[PDB]
Amino acid sequence: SVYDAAAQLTADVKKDLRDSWKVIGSDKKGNGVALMTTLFADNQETIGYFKRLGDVSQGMANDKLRGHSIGLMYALQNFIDQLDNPDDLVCVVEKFAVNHITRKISAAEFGKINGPIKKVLASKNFGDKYANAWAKLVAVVQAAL
Amino acid sequence: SVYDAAAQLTADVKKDLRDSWKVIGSDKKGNGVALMTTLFADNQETIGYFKRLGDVSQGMANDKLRGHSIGLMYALQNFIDQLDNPDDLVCVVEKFAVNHITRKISAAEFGKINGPIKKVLASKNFGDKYANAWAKLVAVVQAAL
Ligand code: HEM
Ligand code: HEM
Structure with missing residues (x-):
């Protein structure tokens, strides 16, 4: 199932993922927090899963949120590094899904x-071409949920 | 406390951590699996915590073990990257401790x-000096458990 989703990660898709990550992953704290705060702003209902983080309105200043955001970027770093070996990407993705399945986070919610x-x-000037590439990587994770 | 433990990471301790990681972190899959297999060999009593992984003696051939081992190395990568900022190291360490606390992994167990x-x-020609530097980093996590 996850292997089939990984099959959508073509040479061009993997290239766009690496190129964009070279920039996005160069500031894990800043972009990681940007991702989370944007998620909370656009889909307020997702805050329900993060009660442990406390006052998420504090953004970067919230130590727990900052810690979670930085850690999130290392999961993506892991995924990007395994792109050339489907066998490793799959085992890393399934490992990652374990705790999210436990939290009852569906593929739709993760999406x-x-x-x-x-x-x-x-915000870093990477257009739709890159967003579609990333949607495909996220789809690999969705296949595991 | 974790804040006092992070203060133990002196200038040369951070330097020895970086110099050794430059080599160890070069092969996350290989060194990660070696780390886990050694743990299970020297402390068979810890295997019980990893029931989900299945037959841990299969080593690299065990997809779940390989997935876990690779991810473990990215957690260390995270710690090393945060050495410059104590405030970020601490929030990342506390974030990391959450799931280990939930599994009832004590400071002694983690050690x-x-x-x-x-x-x-x-195995990579890094002696006691480096082993002690890493023990100091591990001690920061122990303080959070
Ligand atoms: C690109 C997407 C995402 C990445 C890379 C990511 C990464 C991570 C990582 C590495 C952790 C820490 C390890 C763990 O406990 O599993 C984590 C925790 C968590 N994730 Fe995900 N995650 C993502 C999206 C989501 C989404 C969309 C939700 C929910 C709507 C979610 C909810 C959680 C929760 C509740 C935690 C625990 C937070 C805490 O209490 O500290 N994740 N995630
Ligand atoms: C250098 C030390 C260690 C690092 C960097 C590390 C890293 C990790 C990471 C990244 C995860 C996945 C995220 C999560 O679920 O929290 C994890 C899971 C886990 N860790 Fe730790 N860990 C270390 C030592 C230990 C020790 C000593 C034990 C037990 C004696 C332990 C027990 C566990 C268990 C049981 C899991 C879940 C495994 C699974 O079911 O897939 N960890 N650890």
């Missing part, structure tokens, strides 16, 4: 991250 | 990773 990713990419 | 780290370091 809400696509909007924020598109916006963050656009 | 068992020091042996495996020392052995992997030694």
